[PDB]
Amino acid sequence: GLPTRLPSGSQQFMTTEDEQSPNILPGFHPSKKIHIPGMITNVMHMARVDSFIPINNIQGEVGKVSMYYITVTKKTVTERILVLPLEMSNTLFATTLLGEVLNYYANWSGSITITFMCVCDAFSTGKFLVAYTPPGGKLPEDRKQAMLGVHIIWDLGLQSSCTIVVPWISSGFYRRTKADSFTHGGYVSLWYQTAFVPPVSGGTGSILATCSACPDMSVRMLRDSPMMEQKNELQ
Amino acid sequence: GLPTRLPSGSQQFMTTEDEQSPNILPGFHPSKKIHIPGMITNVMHMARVDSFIPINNIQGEVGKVSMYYITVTKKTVTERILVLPLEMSNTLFATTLLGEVLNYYANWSGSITITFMCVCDAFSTGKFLVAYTPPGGKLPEDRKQAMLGVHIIWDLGLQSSCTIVVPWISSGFYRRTKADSFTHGGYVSLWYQTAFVPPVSGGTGSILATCSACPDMSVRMLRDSPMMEQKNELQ
Amino acid sequence: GLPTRLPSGSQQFMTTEDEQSPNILPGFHPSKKIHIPGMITNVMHMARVDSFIPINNIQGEVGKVSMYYITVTKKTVTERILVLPLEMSNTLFATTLLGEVLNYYANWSGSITITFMCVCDAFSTGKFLVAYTPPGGKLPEDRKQAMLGVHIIWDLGLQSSCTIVVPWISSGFYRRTKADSFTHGGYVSLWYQTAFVPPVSGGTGSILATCSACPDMSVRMLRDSPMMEQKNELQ
Amino acid sequence: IETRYVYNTNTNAEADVEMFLGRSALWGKVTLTRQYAKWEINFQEQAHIRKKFEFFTYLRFDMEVTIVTNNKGLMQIMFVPPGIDHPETHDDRKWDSASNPSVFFQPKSGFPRFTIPFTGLASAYYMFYDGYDKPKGSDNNEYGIAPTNDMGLLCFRTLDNSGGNDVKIYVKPKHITAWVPRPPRATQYTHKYSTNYHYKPNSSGPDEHVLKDRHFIKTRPLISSA
Amino acid sequence: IETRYVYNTNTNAEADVEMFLGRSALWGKVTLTRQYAKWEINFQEQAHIRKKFEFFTYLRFDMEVTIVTNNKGLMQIMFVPPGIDHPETHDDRKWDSASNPSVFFQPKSGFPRFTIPFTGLASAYYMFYDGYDKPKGSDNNEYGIAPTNDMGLLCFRTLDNSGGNDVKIYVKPKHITAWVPRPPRATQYTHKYSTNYHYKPNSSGPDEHVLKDRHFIKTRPLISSA
Amino acid sequence: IETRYVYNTNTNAEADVEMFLGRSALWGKVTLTRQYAKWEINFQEQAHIRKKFEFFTYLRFDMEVTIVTNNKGLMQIMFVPPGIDHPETHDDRKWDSASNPSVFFQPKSGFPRFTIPFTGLASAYYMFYDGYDKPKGSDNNEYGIAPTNDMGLLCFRTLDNSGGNDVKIYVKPKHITAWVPRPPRATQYTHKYSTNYHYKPNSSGPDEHVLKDRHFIKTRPLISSA
Amino acid sequence: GAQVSSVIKYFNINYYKDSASSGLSRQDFSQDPSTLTNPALMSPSVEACGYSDRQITIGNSTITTSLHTVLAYGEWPTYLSDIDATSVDKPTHPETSADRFYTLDSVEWQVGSHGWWWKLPDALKDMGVFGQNMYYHSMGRSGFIIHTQCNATKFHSGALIVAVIPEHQLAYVGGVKVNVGYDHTHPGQSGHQIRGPSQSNDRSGGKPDEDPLFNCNGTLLGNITIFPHQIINLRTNNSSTIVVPYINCVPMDNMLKHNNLSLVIIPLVPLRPGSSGINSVPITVTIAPYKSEFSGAMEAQRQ
Amino acid sequence: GAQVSSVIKYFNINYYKDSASSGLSRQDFSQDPSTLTNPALMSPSVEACGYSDRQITIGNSTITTSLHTVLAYGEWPTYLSDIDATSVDKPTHPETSADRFYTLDSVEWQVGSHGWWWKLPDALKDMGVFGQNMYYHSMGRSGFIIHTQCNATKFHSGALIVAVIPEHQLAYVGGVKVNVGYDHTHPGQSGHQIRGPSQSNDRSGGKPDEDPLFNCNGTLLGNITIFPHQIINLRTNNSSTIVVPYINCVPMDNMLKHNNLSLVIIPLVPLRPGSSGINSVPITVTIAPYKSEFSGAMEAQRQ
């Protein structure tokens, strides 16, 4: 009758295709849909929520709650307190809401948002330099080379100055989630602007850090997250 | 010619599908359709018709007409006369028009309607408490714990008070036909409000019970009724 | 249902066909398209660009930069300096932008454009006869038989007279790219009109030649260019 | 042309007689031994589909028949209308018929399907018929619905033997009109076309003639303790 | 009729829950040994697809099931709705069902596909359920989502044995509605329907009862040197 | 709806970059030995199709992939997006993926075809890239277009062994946008991702290290005598 | 193709051009949208449609009782009219001579009495000029009015189920495959006393099933309420009335071979005497042919 | 077929005539075209919708603190209303007698204290006439207001995470396949002190997981911020308030069997005394049932 043709890719079965299918159980009446609080229509809105970065992950501290905070004390000369190499495949970011939404997608774009929170007493005071070195730069090794990039001065007694927004600085339009020398995104490092001055000598600070996506974050090419592995069948 | 594609589920044969088919015997003229009394367009309207519950089903009484009625006498203290655990898979309900329409469907909703009828002489009189304990409650064990649920006082000499309407009280929207602890529907029990007083000491009452669906009863997911089994071929 | 028919050539797979195909990776967002200089929408526009003909290709000169230029001196009698047999399969043309675009196509049409450029000092002067003998004619062997075809007098000290436009003179509408006696396109030869007169006896001229397509050039029937061969796998 | 709105689903649309009986179920199994098989069309054989039609005293429906075979290579089905002789074997001259409708198929291509409209002859099918075909004194009286109709029969042959012998006939009542409702059957069928429920388990030896109901009612230890 | 404009792609359209979960993934593998196979429908078995549904506390979705088999010649699938007994073997009388929906196919023709609408009974599926089916004193309490539903089961038989035994069930959540977001799981699943992550590697001999987390966090030599 | 007039053919419509590069050509061959095969997607392997893309410095195109296999009975292809680990064998647990797109087919039914849109990450593909991925002092610097992208890879397994082992991947650039024109290559490729033309014929013994151009220019006895 | 002459439209199309080739049947609408009970079942009250047709008197015989009449399938009996009829031949209407109340032999209702049934029209075959018109005509159709009347005192007790089963097909008394005999399912006016169940019940000549619980056909009592029925409770009412139209697929059938109704009376609860000494009470049945039609006159089919 | 009732149009068509047979779901438009954040997540400030509903006083008990209240999922608690409800039966609203602040046993926060959790409604089961209405009713729904208050001096240090997890399903303490016991996940008001992790933790009777880092369910802390939460930093604020609506698939559930919330309090950074000598500080929790509804009254489900 009608001259149809079946091209290549007709009798194919593609996992990712979109096709209508016959309904077994016809006339079945689905139970009514009430109003449940918290509907989420998109999985990037999970990446938008702050989540603590395991900034202390070392031999002893991994697997414990102490893996989330860094100890700062008063020191005579500036030191480099912390370095957060910017990759969504790295344990620092990969284990957060941001990084573990982005490890389903093969590359991304937009700005990271990194907030710091110091847990100390009310009498302590400090000035910290938070510096993002763009792609292509070395990790600074001293504060005079860290200050020449993007940086903010995080001052205690404000907590409006905590958040640094890692800008999007890239050649290409997207950055690969898996760290590689071509697209590598740079380094966020933490320094002592002045000092952490406790109310009494020998005092101790404790620093936490969070990461979330900025509204211009975007991702593409959904894939298998490295963040799950099944080595034996579930029974 | 025209680029058609055959997706998955094309050359399938699904028992429950809906498809047009060629007519063998074309031009065949069906015999005319007259008016036959009693047309039934839906099988829930059978469930709407009262049908006697085999409320007495025990070792001796099953298989006989006496399986449909309970004997009540005058007793000094209240007793629990009868318990009808509310399940459509239970021999009590499963064998009625209600229960055996509902055993084709994997779960249901709406109200049961239970009517009691006492067969005695005209001089006997009685007050009965008919109590439905909702899902999650224990079977009462005494009348003071039965009265705290849904209940009606069924009085002889009225026969407007016979029917208790089992309300629909459930968490989910549907209740599984096969009894399970999660959806279990509760218990209808019969008690002596006051007494069954015969016209002469030693008198005897006889009680029958019916069950039908309420107009808001609904069912879904047609399945194989447990109420038929073929263990050998019919010849 | 609908009476479709599958003719012959339905389940075929044709390399050169045109058909829509399902998109693996749906919802994938391509990176934005910026403005890159130099867009080329058609491959004939490469054939339009002048390119040097390897007019000196002989035992010693092939593989070196000296393969592109001819030496002319002052001679008492006219000589035939150069012959460019007109074929797009010939090493002369086949290796240029013109000829190597046209070796993908099984036949062509239109006018070739041949420009000559003399590299000498400013004091040298010369008159050259550039003659195209049409299809069917012998290669001239002397200037009086070369002048009777299409010809131009290329004079140094002008460089407006360099370009000869090989006209399209053919029986059929198209000419086969691979040289054959039936469609053969003729001969462009270079002669001494008068002489190449150096500023001092013993002087030496050096002549280069380019070829490009004219705007009425056309090609058809894309094929495998003889200009590439893979004799072993690339690893 | 017409755009014919209906709905997605309504509440009890599972339960209307069109959807209740409108699933294609197996009405019989035959085997191709000798390359020939024959099945007289009836719903009496399969107890589950038989129980559903017997909620109703009268039904008027089309049926579509779908043949599921594990054989291969080619097959013929012949629908033999009533009142003539069907082919008794393969290679029977009666497989050549100018008139009797037949359907060829190659089982590996698809499942053959056709439709038999309502043949009932009575304006509806009797599920239960309380009367006899022959008059009073007649010697052999068939009781019940057996004389009231015959829906034909399906003859099967195999032109290329190849694979398995097992044929399955799935039919779907469609365009159903059901009339007088009846109680669901409480007991396992012991025969075809017969409404009798007494089983008669044994044959050969002693303890014969004790027979069972085979009903679905089961007991409980105490009333009031449930 | 209606022309329904959408777009080609938007920025994060990769990430919306419809596209995130809207790929057809393997929810279970069975083997046809004896010609029979059975699979209770769940996503608990495969850790990768299980981890994605568990970003969300509640899901409401249709599912379409696609059966990829290396067997040949013919097959039957029977979707057994809850609350009845499924066929326990091939050649089981319960493969003849007037009602239970079933699908025949010949694996060399195509891949069979059907749709199971939302059966949840609760208005959404519980991915995580913090409560028990039975009351307090009850002796056997199932904890979690196991009592909250059953999506049915799929019975498989093979009418013509022929090729391989391996069945694969790929299903695609479609028409998804997801509600309460949860942290992604950080640890390898050690059970079904259970949220416990402690592995318990060994059984038979000494050094038993030491058990592992199996998390995905890995260390770095020095903070500040990264 | 829209009626979209074009033409039959125009003069040079053979030569426009859409038709020039718009034929489906073989970009690689693999073998199914062990039932597993793997191919990293590139045009570098086949010298003829490589020479055509290299008239242009930059290309932006979709590609459709068509798999021509002489095997039978069933197959799986898995497109593994960059940045994760592909299945290393058949019967590898990583063939079960909630996310990685994969395509099942039965080679005797048809030829499977899908489309990979433009993944370039740069807004166009580099055919030639004059720069390095790592900075100056870095120890291992990849030169050329190798770091600039990866188009994924295709993993192949066979669920039913049956016939031949030979897979052929034909892809068609479509929706092409080509930018900076370059001279056609005059010399036979000696490597992948590398633009070097020196062949180095021998290895083991003497007369090693003499290497060839392998160009396409051939001589003539006399200028002026042609 | 063809067509024909939460809300989803669809183009109605017959791909195969025919009816009955069409798929399953849904409920159409012409425009967009935007049922629970069937009163025909449930045995209405004969006032639930109209009472103008009804003190009950058919054809020279009187019944004085009629809001408690059940109208079977909510349909009032009526003549075949036309357009539903096969033959054009004008049927005979006997009217008041053959449409009248015929009272049958009373039956003692005792302790242990299992039940009774009568087949119709059969019970009336010897009754009056209705039972004459059966034999002299090929075919016929009739509606009936069954008045069942059992009176005891206020001291007595026990209940009956009076049901009318269309096409009540009896089961053979047990064992092997046998059709019940023509004679045992056509008892006459005396009907059939259900004497079983027992393992000792005689099996010969196709005798019908004696078990009242399974309705003799294998379907439980208590589901017998799906048919038109009344329950006579000696505490409440002494009598019963049921008005059945003509139920059958055919416009007219033989009436000798085909019994299109059955009147079944089952002692649902036994009869217990009170202080009174009366151990048994008569049950009387009075049947009125109503709107009866006969056609195809011949010699009396009587043997 | 059917249909239904850089920019690409498409004809909406159901080839199989049904919903749910349709393909995947996109975002339709009627005419041509020619989103980034969800404020419901991220735990709004209860002023980020409206503050008119709120000095905080429910039902005869007063809290004086309310811009820093987090409104869980940006939804204010409200009664079930209708049309979302299963039963038509009118629920009971106890209002100010059972909707009031119930303060629980304070818990010492020490160095080395791993955390605490309370299940809801369970914690309130013995509290007042809210805890009475649980037992006497089949079902119920309630929204809660959790006020967590821990006060130290300016010399002290350390932070807590106060989070409310819907459907927090505990992991069994290790090894084999066991359901955690009904009793260990229903601790009462005392909640559960997290004493682990260790390899020596007792495994019996289904005891819950003691590891605070994995949230006892196997998901990291620091991702616990996806739930409604507040961080109490003793350098900044001493207290917390969280307003949760009723989260569940069902309109009403049992409240004895199903705990639809969990209040988890984790010492994110330990408690360090300053120059002061105070090594431990009490943490107090005050829960207010809000907009609670009960239906299906019965005998007390109490054992």
UniProtKB/Swiss-Prot annotation, chains D, E, F:
Q: Which species is listed as the source?
A: Human rhinovirus C (strain C15)
Q: Which residues of the full protein are shown?
A: 621 to 846 of 2153
Where does the UniProt annotation locate this protein?
Answer: Virion; Host cytoplasm
Subunit comment = Interacts with capsid protein VP0, and capsid protein VP3 to form heterotrimeric protomers. Five protomers subsequently associate to form pentamers which serve as building blocks for the capsid. Interacts with capsid protein VP2, capsid protein VP3 and capsid protein VP4 following cleavage of capsid protein VP0. Interacts (via C-terminus) with capsid protein VP4 (via C-terminus). Interacts with host CDHR3 (via N-terminus); this interaction occurs near each threefold vertex of the capsid and allows the virus attachment and entry into the host cell.
What name is this protein filed under?
Capsid protein VP1
Q: What's the stated role of this polypeptide? A: Forms an icosahedral capsid of pseudo T=3 symmetry with capsid proteins VP2 and VP3. The capsid is 300 Angstroms in diameter, composed of 60 copies of each capsid protein and enclosing the viral positive strand RNA genome. Capsid protein VP1 mainly forms the vertices of the capsid. The VP1 C-termini form 60 dominant spike-like protrusions on the surface of the virion. Capsid protein VP1 interacts with host cell receptor CDHR3 to provide virion attachment to target host cells. This attachment induces virion internalization. Tyrosine kinases are probably involved in the entry process.
UniProtKB/Swiss-Prot annotation, chains G, H:
Note the site residues: Cleavage. M42, S43
- Output the superkingdom of the source species: Viruses
**Compositionally skewed regions (Polar residues) per UniProt:** 187-203
Q: Where is the lipid attached (N-myristoyl glycine)?
A: G1
Q: Where in the cell is it found?
A: Virion; Host cytoplasm
Q: What processing steps or modifications follow its translation? A: Myristoylation is required for the formation of pentamers during virus assembly. Further assembly of 12 pentamers and a molecule of genomic RNA generates the provirion.
Region spans: Disordered:
184-211
Q: What does this protein do?
A: Component of immature procapsids, which is cleaved into capsid proteins VP4 and VP2 after maturation. Allows the capsid to remain inactive before the maturation step.
Q: How does it assemble?
A: Interacts with capsid protein VP1 and capsid protein VP3 to form heterotrimeric protomers.
| Protein name as it appears in the record | Capsid protein VP0
